[PDB]
Design a protein around this ligand. Structure first.
Ligand code: CDL
Ligand code: PCF
Ligand code: PEF
Ligand code: PEF
Ligand code: PEF
Ligand code: PEF
Ligand code: PEF
Ligand code: PEF
Ligand code: PEF
Ligand code: HEM
Ligand code: HEM
Ligand code: HEM
Lengths: 76, 57, 126, 431, 385, 62, 48, 110
C-alpha cells in the first residue's frame, strides 16, 4: 500500500542512559560484579576472619591455608 | 579451537580481569604452599619441628 | 535544572484558571517586589544563569539591540552592587518594563532540544 | 528480470529495460588489476585508454557510438553505447576494433601518445586527488605483497617501463572466452543480442587465464605519507571486510550504513541519525567522512575514510569513530539497524537502478562474472530486511571487535597517533 | 610578553593571583577562601614548630604539650595559635561553605569545585580529630574511644577495623603514635586538595553575589582583591590575636588539662565545638550503625545539593523564601551544635532528632520544593495572561 | 621507487597469521603479567596493613 | 630473629619479580614491535 | 573531545603521562626519572608506616627502631625497604644526574 506516517514510540531514557542500553549492558555488569568479587576474594585472602568464614571452606585450597603449629610452640 | 579460546576468555574484558583475579587467588595459595614446602624440605633437621622431635625421642 | 517548558506549563495553568490567578498572582507580585532585582535595574531574564547550552543558544539567538541593552543592565547592576547602593528611584525597572524577552527563545531552544532527545531515543513500531 | 545464458563459448548477460532510451553493449572481462605484477602495473589502464583513443573513438563517433571503459581490481569492461536501433553497429565495432583487429590500436605513434597521456594522468592523480590516493594506499598496505594491493591507475614507475608487447601479452593472457561476459543493458532483448552474437562469429581467444599463486590476505599495517604543505589531513582506516559471495556481505554493507556518510558543510547532513555527530559536531572534528564496505573476489575492506582541517584533534576524531564501531559489537540498538536498513535499500536502489545503462552493464558483468548470475533487487531487499540486531552483533564480534586495522594517510597527519594507540580503540575495557 | 607571563612558574602565580579576572561585584564573603589558605599556613607552620618538641608516646604526650607550654620559648604562643587557629579554620570554613550554599556556587559549572570542597571538608574534620587526640587529655582519650568504638557497629568486620585502628585492644600508645603520624601527614593531602580546589576554581572563575554572568565586568585580582583580602587578613589576625592572647582557653574544654586516664569517665564526653553538630546527628539516631551512617550522610548530603537545587536563577540573593529557609538552616546548625554539647536528657533528645530531621530536609525536601515554587512565582509575577 | 611498493617486512612477519592464535598468545602474556602483578599488589597492601594491625608487644599483654 | 621468614619471603619475592621482569620485557617488545620495525623511504619532492 | 582531554585533572594526567610526546629514540637512561618517582613513593609510604611506631626521644629512638625490627609485623620489611630504598634512591639519582651530564640535558632550553 502507501504509508503516509512513520509510527514510532519515544522509548525510555534518562537523558544519556537508555533502557535498551541498560538491557544490552546488564550481563556484562553482572560479569564485572563477579570480577570485582573475585578481586575482593584476592585482596582479602590474608584476613583471618574471611579465611574462617569463606576461604577455608574451599575443597582443595581450604585446609591448605590453615596452620599446624601445636599449642606448645605458640607464645600466645 | 583457538577461536573458542579467544571468544570465551579474551573477548570480554570483564571475563578477562575476572580470570586474572581468580588465577591470582589460586596462584597465591598454591605458590605460597610450594615455597613453604620447598623451604622446609631444604632445611630438614634445622627447623624447630625437627629439634622438637629429637627432644621427644 | 528545572526546564523552562515545565515552568511555562505550570504558570500557564495557574494563569488560565480564574481562581488560581486571583489567588496566586498578587502573591507573586509581592514576591517580585520583595525580591528586589528591579532596584538594581535588572529585568528577570538577566537573572537566569546562562552557563548551559540551552541558555547559550537563546543568548546567541537574541537580537542585537536586546543583547546590548542586557549587557548594559548587567554591567550597571554589577557597578551598583559594587558601590553597595541601589539605583535611584527613577532608574528602577518599572513593572511594565519587566517583559520576558528571552523567554520565547529559551522555550524554542528547549523544545528543539527535547525533540532532538526524543528522536535520539525512538523505537520504531515493528 | 535479467537473463544470462552461456552460448557455445561465451556468456551473454542482458538486463532489458524498454523504458530506457539508449542501449549499452559491451564485454566485461573478469581480470582486473589484481591480475598484474608490480612490474606491469597499469597495463589495464593503458588498455582502457587505447580503447578510448582518439583514433578508436572517431570510428565509433562516426556511427553514433559512445565508448565507456572501466578498470577495477576484479573486472575490466569495454562498453559501447548506442541508440536502441544501433545494437548491430555496437557489436560490429566491438568485434572489429577491439577483438579482431587489435593490432591497429596498438600501433606506434598511437601507443606512444596514449602512454604519454596516461603518464600525465597518473601524475595528476598522484599529486592532486588526495582522498582517492589515500584509499589506494589503504589497499596498498592492507594487502601488501599480494595481488589486491595493485592500484588500478598503475604506478608512475611501472607505467614508464611498458611497451606494446606488454599490452599484447596481457591481451593474450586475459582477453579470453572463458574470462569474458558480453553484456547488454538498456533496451535490447536477450533473444536479439544472442541472435546477433550467433550471427557474426564473435570469439575472443581460446586459452585459460593464469591462476594466481597466492590468494589475497589482509595484513594489518599502516602507511603515513604526511605532506605538511597540504591544507587538510586525509585518513582512511579499515578492518578486513567480507568478500563478495559471503553470507555476511549485506550485513557488512548494513553495518557500513549504520554510521553512513557525512558532509559537515551540508545542513541536511548534520541532522542524520548517527550518534557520532554528537561527538564530532562540538569541536567540528571532521569535514566529511564516509563508511564503505568494499568486497572483492578474494577479500574485502570495511572501515571509513575522512578528511579534516582540524589537524590537532585527529586523535579525537579517530577515537570517537572507533568507539562508535565498538557499539556494533556491544550495544547497537534496533532503530539504528532499521534506519540503516531503509537507507541501505535506498542506496542499493540508487546504485543499481539508475537511468545510466553503462553503470548497469558494469555491475551486471561483474556480478555474473563472480557469481555466475545476478541477484535481483527484490531478493536483495529480502536479504536486507532479514538482517537482525543479533546478526550485526555476531558479524561485529567476528570482524570488528579487537581486530587488526589497516590505516593510510596523507597531509597534516602529525596529530594522527601511531598504530598501537589507534588499535587499542578496537576493544574497550567494557566501559 | 612579560616575564610574569612567559616564565613557567610565574605564569602560574600570575594566572592565579596577579591577572586572575575576578568579577567586580564580589563582596567580603569571597575573602574567606584566602582566609582559609591563611589558616592552613598558620596551622602547618605552628604544627611543625611544635612537632619539633612534641613526643607522641602515651606517657609523654601530655607532658610534652606541657613542656611546650612551659619550657619552650614562646611555646604557649605556638600552642594557643595552633588550637585557636584550628577553631578559626573551622569558623572560616563554615562561612565559606555557607556562602557557597547561599550564593549557589555549587551549580552546573562548579560541581567539581563543590565536590573537591566537600573532600577538603572531610579531610579537615579528620585532621582536627586526630590532632585533638594527640594532646591526650581527658577529652582526647575518651573522644578517641567513643568515635573509634563507633566502627564496631559494622556487622561484618567491625571488631577487625576497630582493633586495626586502635593498634591493640583500647586506645593506647600505638593509637596515639598512629594519630600523630596521620596528623602530620593529612594536612599535606589537604594542601594538594587545595591545589585541586584552585584548579576547579580556575577553569570557570568565581561567582558573584548577583548570580548573573560575570564575563562582562571583570577586574584583575592584583591591586584590587589583594588589598581587599588584606583587610580581612588583618581582621582575622586581630580576632585571632585577641583569642590567643587574652582568652586562650575559651574555645577549649577544660577537661583536656587532666591527663589521659582510661579508668575514669569524665561524666560528659564531648569533642571540639566544630564537630558538635555532627556529634548531635550521631547521637540522634538510637542505633550505632545507623548513627555513624547518618553522620557520614550529614557530611555527604552536600553532594546532593547540585541536583536538588531546582532553581533557574543562581543564589538566594533575589529569593525571599530561599533566604528565609537558608537562615533557618543556619540557626538549625547552631541549635544542633548546642544540642550536641548538652547531655542526653529529655527535651534535648527530641530537639536533637527534630533538628537532625530539619538538617536533612533542607537539602532533600525544602530546597527542591521552595525553588520550584519560586520558579513558578517568578514566572507568573511578570507574565501577563 | 614507488610508494605502492611496500618494503620487505618478511623477516619480522610471522608465517602463519591466524588472528585468534596470535591474540591468545599476546593476551596470555599480558594476563600473566597482570596475574603476578595482582598477587604482588595484594601481598604489598597486606604487608602494609598487617604492619598497621598490632604488635607482638601488646599481643603478649592481651 | 626474622632470618628464616625473611629468606622465605625473599624466595617468594625474587621468583615473582623475576617472572614479572621477563614478562614485562616480552610485553615491551610486543608493544614496541610496530615502532621497532618501521621503514622510512624518501622520494624527494618536486621543486615548486 | 575525549574525557581525558576535557576534564580538569585528567587533562593534567593526560598531558604528562598519557599523551605526552616523547621522542622515539630515547633509551633506558630516560627510565631513571620514573624510577626516582617510584623510589620517592616507596620512601614516603614506608616512612609513614614506620613513623606510626617510631618514638623520637633520645632515649627511645634506637629502641623504637629496634621495636620496629622486632615487634612490628613485617616491620623489618619496612625498615630495610626504607634504608635500602634510600640507597637506591641515591643510586638512581646519580644515574639521572650523570645522564643529564652525558647527554647535555642541562643546556640552553633546559
Ligand atoms: C580503575 C579504573 C579507572 C578507570 O576509569 O578505567 C577506565 C576503563 C575504561 O576504558 P575504555 O572504556 O576502554 O576507554 C575508552 C574511553 O573513551 C577512554 O579512552 P582514552 O583514549 O581516554 O583511554 C586512555 C586509557 C589509557 O590508560 C592509561 O593511560 C594507563 C596509564 C597509567 C599510568 C600510571 O585510559 C583507560 O581508559 C584505561 C585506564 C586503566 C586504569 C588505570 C587506573 C590506574 C590507577 C592508579 O575501565 C577499565 O579500565 C576497567 C578495568 C578495571 C580493572 C580493575 C583492575 C585494575 C584496577 C586499577
Ligand atoms: C595493581 C596491579 C593490578 C594489575 C591488574 C592487571 C589486570 O587486571 O588485567 C590487565 C588488563 C588487560 O587489559 P588489555 O590488555 O587492554 O585488554 C583489553 C581487553 N581485550 C583486548 C582483551 C578485549 O588491563 C586492564 O584492563 C586495565 C587495568 C590496569 C591497571
Ligand atoms: C628581586 C628583584 C630581581 C630583579 C627584578 C627585575 O629586574 O624585574 C624584571 C622582571 C620583569 O621584566 P619584564 O617582565 O619587564 O621583561 C623582561 C625583559 N625586559 O621582574 C619580574 O621578575 C616579575 C616580577 C613579578 C614577581 C611576582 C612574585 C609573586 C610570587 C610571590
Ligand atoms: C625549598 C624552596 C625553594 C623554592 C625555590 C622555587 C623557585 C625555583 C628555582 C628555579 C631556579 C631557576 O633556574 O630559575 C630560573 C628560571 C629562568 O626562567 P626561564 O626559563 O623562563 O627563562 C630563561 C631564558 N631563556 O626561572 C625563573 O626565573 C624563576 C624565578 C621565579 C620563581 C617562581 C616562584 C615560585 C613559584 C612556584 C609555583 C608553585 C606551583 C607548584 C604547585 C605544587
Ligand atoms: C604505593 C606504595 C608502593 C610500595 C612499593 C613497595 C614494593 C617495591 C619493591 C620492594 C621489594 C618487593 C616487595 C617487598 C614487600 C612485600 O610485600 O613482599 C612480600 C611478597 C610476598 O610475601 P607474602 O605474600 O608471603 O607475605 C607478605 C605479608 N606476610 O613478595 C612479593 O610478592 C612482591 C611482589 C612485588 C610486586 C609489586 C607490585 C606493585 C604493587 C603496588 C601496590
Ligand atoms: C582499611 C582496611 C583494614 C583491613 C583490616 O582490618 O585488617 C585486618 C587484617 C588482620 O589480619 P593480618 O593478615 O594483618 O594478620 C593477622 C595476625 N597475623 O589485616 C589484613 O592483612 C587483611 C586485610 C588487608 C587489607 C585489605 C585491603 C583491600 C581491601
Ligand atoms: C571503573 C570506572 C569506569 C567508568 C566508566 C568509564 O570508563 O567511562 C569511559 C570514559 C569515556 O570517555 P570518552 O572519551 O569516551 O567520553 C565520551 C563522552 N561522550 O572514559 C573515562 O572515564 C576517562 C578514561 C581516562 C582514564 C585515565 C586513567 C588515569 C591513569 C592515572 C590515574 C591517576 C594517577 C595520578 C598520578
Ligand atoms: C583524588 C581525586 C579527587 C577527584 C574529585 C572529583 C570530584 C568530582 O566530582 O569531579 C568530577 C570531574 C568531572 O566532571 P566534569 O567533566 O563534568 O567537569 C569537568 C570540567 N572541565 O572530574 C573527575 O572525573 C575526576 C577524575 C578523577 C581524578 C583524576 C586524578 C586525580 C589526580 C590528578 C592530578 C592532580 C594534580 C594535583 C597536584 C598538582
Ligand atoms: C614521577 C612520575 C613519573 C611519570 C611517568 C610515570 C610512568 C609510569 C611508570 C610506572 C609504570 C606503570 C605501569 C602501568 C601499566 C598500565 O597502566 O597498563 C594499562 C594497559 C592499557 O592497555 P592498552 O590501552 O594498551 O590496551 C590495548 C587494548 N585495549 O593495560 C594493560 O596492558 C595492563 C597489563 C598489566 C599491567 C600491570 C602493571 C602493574 C604495575 C605495578 C607497579 C606500578 C608502579
Ligand atoms: C590542617 C591543619 C591542622 C589542623 C586543623 C590541626 C588541628 C589541631 C588541633 C585542633 C589540635 C589540638 C590543639 C589543642 O587543643 O591543644 C592539634 C594539635 C596538634 N597539631 Fe595540629 N592541626 C593542623 C596541622 C598540623 C600539622 C601540619 C602538624 C604537624 C607538623 C600539626 C601538629 C600538631 C601537634 C604536634 C599537636 C599536638 C598538641 C599541641 O601542641 O597543640 N598540626 N592540631
Ligand atoms: C582548606 C580549605 C579551603 C580553601 C583554601 C579554599 C580556597 C578557596 C578559594 C581561595 C576560593 C576562591 C575565593 C572564593 O570564592 O571564596 C574558593 C572558592 C570556593 N570554594 Fe573553597 N576552599 C576551601 C574549602 C572549601 C570547602 C570546605 C568548600 C565547600 C564544600 C569549598 C567550596 C568552594 C566553592 C563552592 C567555591 C566557589 C565560590 C564562588 O566562586 O562562588 N571550599 N575556595
Ligand atoms: C625523601 C625520601 C626519604 C629519604 C631519602 C629517607 C631517608 C632515610 C634514611 C636514609 C633513613 C635511615 C635508615 C636507617 O639507616 O635506618 C631514614 C630513616 C627514617 N625515615 Fe626516612 N627517608 C625518606 C622519607 C621519609 C618520610 C617522609 C618519613 C616520615 C613519614 C620517613 C621516616 C623515617 C623514619 C621514621 C626513620 C627512622 C629510622 C628507621 O626506622 O629507618 N622517611 N630515612
Amino acid at each position: 500500500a502507501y504509508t503516509s506516517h512513520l509510527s514510532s514510540k519515544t522509548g525510555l531514557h534518562f537523558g544519556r542512559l537508555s533502557l535498551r542500553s541498560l538491557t544490552a549492558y546488564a550481563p556484562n555488569l553482572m560479569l564485572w560484579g563477579g570480577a570485582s568479587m573475585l578481586g575482593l576474594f584476592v585482596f582479602t585472602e590474608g584476613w583471618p576472619k574471611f579465611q574462617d568464614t569463606l576461604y577455608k571452606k574451599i575443597p582443595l585450597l581450604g585446609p591448605t591455608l590453615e596452620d599446624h603449629t601445636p599449642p606448645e610452640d605458640k607464645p600466645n | 579451537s583457538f577461536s573458542s579460546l579467544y571468544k570465551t576468555f579474551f573477548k570480554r574484558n570483564a571475563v578477562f580481569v575476572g580470570t586474572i583475579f581468580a588465577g591470582a587467588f589460586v596462584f597465591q595459595t598454591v605458590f605460597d604452599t610450594a615455597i613453604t614446602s620447598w623451604y622446609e624440605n631444604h632445611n630438614k633437621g634445622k627447623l624447630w619441628k625437627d629439634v622438637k622431635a629429637r627432644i621427644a625421642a | 535544572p528545572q526546564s523552562f517548558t515545565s515552568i511555562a506549563r505550570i504558570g500557564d495553568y495557574i494563569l488560565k484558571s480564574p481562581v488560581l490567578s486571583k489567588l496566586c498572582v498578587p502573591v507573586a507580585n509581592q514576591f517580585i517586589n520583595l525580591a528586589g532585582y528591579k532596584k538594581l535595574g535588572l529585568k528577570f531574564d538577566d537573572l537566569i544563569a546562562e552557563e548551559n547550552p540551552i541558555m547559550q543558544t537563546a543568548l546567541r539567538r537574541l537580537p542585537e539591540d536586546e543583547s546590548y541593552a542586557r549587557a548594559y543592565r548587567i554591567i550597571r547592576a554589577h557597578q551598583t552592587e559594587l558601590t553597595h547602593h541601589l539605583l535611584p528611584r527613577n532608574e528602577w525597572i518599572k513593572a511594565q518594563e519587566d517583559v520576558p524577552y528571552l523567554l520565547p527563545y529559551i522555550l524554542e531552544a528547549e523544545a528543539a532540544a527535547k525533540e532532538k532527545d526524543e528522536l535520539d531515543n525512538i523505537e520504531v513500531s515493528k | 528480470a535479467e537473463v544470462t545464458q552461456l552460448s557455445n563459448g561465451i556468456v551473454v548477460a542482458t538486463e532489458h529495460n524498454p523504458s530506457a532510451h539508449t542501449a549499452s553493449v559491451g564485454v566485461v572481462f573478469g581480470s582486473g588489476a589484481a591480475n598484474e605484477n608490480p612490474y606491469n602495473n597499469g597495463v589495464s589502464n593503458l588498455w582502457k585508454n587505447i580503447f578510448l583513443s582518439k583514433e578508436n573513438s572517431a570510428v565509433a563517433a562516426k556511427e553514433g557510438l559512445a565508448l565507456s571503459s572501466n578498470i577495477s581490481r576484479d573486472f575490466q569492461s569495454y562498453i559501447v553505447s548506442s541508440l536502441p536501433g544501433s545494437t548491430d553497429k555496437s557489436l560490429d565495432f566491438l568485434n572489429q576494433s577491439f577483438i579482431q583487429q587489435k593490432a591497429n590500436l596498438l600501433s606506434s605513434s598511437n601507443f606512444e601518445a596514449t602512454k604519454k597521456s596516461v603518464l600525465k594522468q597518473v601524475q595528476d592523480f598522484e599529486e592532486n586527488d588526495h582522498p582517492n590516493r589515500v584509499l589506494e594506499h589503504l589497499h596498498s598496505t592492507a594487502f601488501q605483497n599480494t595481488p589486491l594491493s595493485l592500484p588500478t591507475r598503475g604506478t608512475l614507475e611501472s607505467l614508464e617501463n611498458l611497451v606494446v608487447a606488454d599490452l599484447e601479452s596481457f591481451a593474450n593472457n586475459h582477453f579470453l572466452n572463458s574470462n569474458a561476459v558480453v553484456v547488454g543493458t538498456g533496451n535490447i532483448k536477450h533473444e536479439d543480442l544472442v541472435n546477433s552474437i550467433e550471427s557474426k562469429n564473435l570469439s575472443l581467444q581460446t586459452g585459460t587465464k593464469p591462476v594466481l599463486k597466492k590468494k589475497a590476505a589482509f595484513l594489518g599495517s599502516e602507511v603515513r605519507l604526511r605532506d605538511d604543505t597540504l591544507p587538510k589531513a586525509w585518513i582512511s582506516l579499515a578492518v578486513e571486510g567480507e568478500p563478495v559471495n559471503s553470507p555476511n556481505y549485506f550485513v557488512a554493507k548494513l553495518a557500513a550504513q549504520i554510521f553512513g556518510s557525512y558532509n559537515a558543510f551540508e545542513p541536511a547532513s548534520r541532522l542524520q541519525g548517527i550518534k557520532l555527530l554528537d561527538n564530532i559536531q562540538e569541536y567540528q572534528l571532521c569535514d566529511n567522512f564516509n563508511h564503505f564496505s568494499l568486497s572483492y573476489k578474494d577479500s574485502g575492506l570495511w572501515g571509513f575514510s575522512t578528511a579534516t582541517r582540524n589537524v590537532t584533534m585527529i586523535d579525537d576524531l579517530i577515537h570517537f569513530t572507533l568507539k562508535q564501531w565498538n557499539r556494533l559489537t556491544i550495544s547497537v540498538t534496533d532503530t539504528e539497524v532499521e534506519r540503516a536498513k531503509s537507507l541501505l535499500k535506498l542506496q542499493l536502489g540508487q546504485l543499481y537502478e539508475s537511468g545510466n545503462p553503462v553503470n548497469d552493464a558494469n555491475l551486471l558483468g561483474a556480478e555474473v562474472l563472480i557469481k555466475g548470475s545476478k541477484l535481483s533487487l527484490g531478493e536483495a531487499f529480502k536479504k536486507i530486511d532479514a538482517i537482525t540486531v543479533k546478526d550485526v552483533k555476531a558479524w561485529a564480534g567476528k570482524r570488528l571487535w579487537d581486530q587488526d586495522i589497516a590505516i593510510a594517510g596523507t597531509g597534516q597527519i602529525e596529530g594522527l597517533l601511531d598504530y598501537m594507540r589507534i588499535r587499542s580503540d578496537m576493544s574497550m575495557m567494557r566501559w | 610578553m612579560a616575564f610574569r607571563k612567559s616564565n613557567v612558574y610565574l605564569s602560574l602565580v600570575n594566572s592565579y593571583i596577579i591577572d586572575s579576572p575576578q568579577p567586580s561585584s564580589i563582596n567580603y564573603w569571597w575573602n574567606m577562601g584566602s582566609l582559609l589558605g591563611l589558616c592552613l599556613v598558620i596551622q602547618i607552620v605552628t604544627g611543625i614548630f611544635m612537632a619539633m618538641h612534641y613526643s607522641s608516646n602515651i606517657e609523654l604526650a601530655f607532658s610534652s604539650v606541657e613542656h611546650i607550654m612551659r619550657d619552650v620559648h614562646n611555646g604557649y604562643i605556638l600552642r594557643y595559635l595552633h588550637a585557636n587557629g584550628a577553631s578559626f579554620f573551622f569558623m572560616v570554613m563554615f562561612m565559606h561553605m555557607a556562602k557557597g550554599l547561599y550564593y549557589g556556587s555549587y551549580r552546573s559549572p562548579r560541581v567539581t569545585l563543590w565536590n573537591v570542597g566537600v573532600i577538603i571538608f572531610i579531610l579537615t574534620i579528620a585532621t582536627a580529630f586526630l590532632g585533638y587526640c594527640c594532646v591526650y587529655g581527658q577529652m582526647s582519650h575518651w573522644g578517641a574511644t567513643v568515635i573509634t568504638n563507633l566502627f564496631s557497629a559494622i556487622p561484618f568486620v567491625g571488631n577487625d577495623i576497630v582493633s586495626w585502628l586502635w593498634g591493640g585492644f583500647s586506645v593506647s600508645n600505638p593509637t596515639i603514635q598512629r594519630f600523630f603520624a596521620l596528623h602530620y601527614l593529612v594536612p599535606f593531602i589537604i594542601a594538594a586538595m587545595v591545589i585541586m580546589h584552585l584548579m576547579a576554581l580556575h577553569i570557570h572563575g568565581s561567582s558573584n553575589p548577583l548570580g548573573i554572568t560575570g564575563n562582562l565586568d571583570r577586574i584583575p585580582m592584583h591591586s584590587y582583591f589583594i588589598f581587599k583580602d588584606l583587610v580581612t587578613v588583618f581582621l582575622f589576625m586581630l580576632i585571632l590575636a585577641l583569642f590567643v592572647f587574652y582568652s586562650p582557653n575559651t574555645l577549649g574544654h577544660p577537661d583536656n588539662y587532666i591527663p589521659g586516664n582510661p579508668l575514669v569517665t569524665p561524666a560528659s564526653i564531648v569533642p571540639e565545638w566544630y564537630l558538635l553538630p555532627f556529634y548531635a546527628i550521631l547521637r540522634s539516631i538510637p542505633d550505632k550503625l545507623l548513627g555513624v551512617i547518618t553522620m557520614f550522610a550529614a557530611i555527604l548530603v552536600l553532594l546532593v545539593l547540585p541536583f536538588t537545587d531546582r532553581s533557574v536563577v543562581r543564589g538566594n540573593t533575589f529569593k525571599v523564601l530561599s533566604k528565609f529557609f537558608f537562615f533557618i538552616f543556619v540557626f538549625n546548625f547552631v541549635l544542633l551544635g548546642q544540642i550536641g554539647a548538652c547531655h542526653v536528657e529529655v527535651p534535648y533528645v527530641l530537639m536533637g532528632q527534630i533538628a537532625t530531621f530539619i538538617y536533612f530536609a533542607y537539602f532533600l525536601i525544602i530546597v527542591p520544593v521552595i525553588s520550584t515554587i519560586e520558579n513558578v512565582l517568578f514566572y507568573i509575577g511578570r507574565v501577563n495572561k | 621507487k614507488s610508494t605502492y611498493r611496500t618494503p620487505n617486512f618478511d623477516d619480522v612477519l610471522k608465517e602463519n597469521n591466524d588472528a585468534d592464535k596470535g591474540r591468545s598468545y599476546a593476551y596470555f602474556m599480558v594476563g600473566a603479567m597482570g596475574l603476578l602483578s595482582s598477587a604482588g599488589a595484594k601481598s604489598t597492601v597486606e604487608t602494609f596493613i598487617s604492619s598497621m594491625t598490632a604488635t607482638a608487644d601488646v599481643l603478649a599483654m592481651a | 630473629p626474622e632470618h628464616d621468614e625473611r629468606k622465605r619471603l625473599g624466595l617468594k619475592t625474587v621468583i615473582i619479580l623475576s617472572s614479572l621482569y621477563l614478562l614485562s620485557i616480552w610485553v615491551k617488545k610486543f608493544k614496541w614491535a610496530g615502532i621497532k620495525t618501521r621503514k622510512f623511504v624518501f622520494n624527494p619532492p618536486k621543486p615548486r
